[PDB]
Design a binder for this molecule. Sequence first.
Ligand SMILES: CCCCCCCCCCCCCCCC(=O)O
Length: 134
Amino acid sequence: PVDFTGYWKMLVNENFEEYLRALDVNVALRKIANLLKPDKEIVQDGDHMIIRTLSTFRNYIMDFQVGKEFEEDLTGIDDRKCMTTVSWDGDKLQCVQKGEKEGRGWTQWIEGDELHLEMRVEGVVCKQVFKKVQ
Ligand SMILES: CCCCCCCCCCCCCCCC(=O)O
């Protein structure tokens, strides 16, 4: 129902260190991750979506079909594998990442001209907000 396509620049990033710590990311990697302001480059055609999380250190690329569970390879983040499902909850996207860590997933939605992302794991919540450049 909503087209997320766009190049979205980071405005807000709250509790990212704590989120990474809960994924057992080591001190050195967390240190460099502190230097980052990752952006989102999204291309969508209906339920087919590509979400590229772009940073000067490393990118993380998702390419999936909404509604279809898949094996997600989190190489570059925590190098884990999850059984992951992204679903439409109205105009919002809900992602559950089944695997080692409890409560791992995210929710993505647009409010006005802002892209909102809430990342979760083990009760930790990281809030990110992005905007296209007008
Ligand atoms: C570990 C340092 C690398 C950090 C650079 C990439 C940041 C990725 C953050 C975790 C994965 C984000 C998943 C994106 C989901 C979404 O945007 O809908």
